[PDB]
Structure 1
Amino acid sequence: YSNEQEQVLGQIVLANFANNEGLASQGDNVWAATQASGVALLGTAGSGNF
């Protein structure tokens, strides 16, 4: 901002799956979770499994 002010509008989430190769591809370069692929398990890019 013009007044030397910084604001945060959010953070991008990351999802790690307990099992890959279960994400069925859907048309364009995206994947849809299903059975044998686990829940999204949302996380943060800071530290951990991400």
Structure 2
Amino acid sequence: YSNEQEQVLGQIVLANFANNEGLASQGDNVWAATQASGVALLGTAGSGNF
């Protein structure tokens, strides 16, 4: 902005599946979660499972 002030509009989340290679391909270069694929297990991009 024009007043030397910092604002955050959010951060992009990462959905790291517990079990890869079980994602069914859909659309264009996107994957859809289903059975035998696990939950998203969302989190930040700092460290850990991301």
TM > 0.5: yes
**RMSD over aligned Cα atoms:** 0.7
Give the drift of 1:25: 0.6
Q: Which runs of 5+ in 1 are unaligned?
A: none
Name the structure with the higher strand share.
2
Can you list the C-alpha shifts for 1:1-50, whole angstroms capped at 9, x where unaligned? 11101100111100111100111010201000111110011011011110
CA distance in 2, matches of 1:41, 1:20: 12
Q: Which runs of 5+ in 2 are unaligned?
A: none
Give the TM-score normalised by structure 1.
0.92
Identity of aligned residues (%): 100
CA distance in 1, matches of 2:22, 2:14: 18
Give the TM-score normalised by structure 2.
0.92
Number of residue pairs matched by the alignment: 50
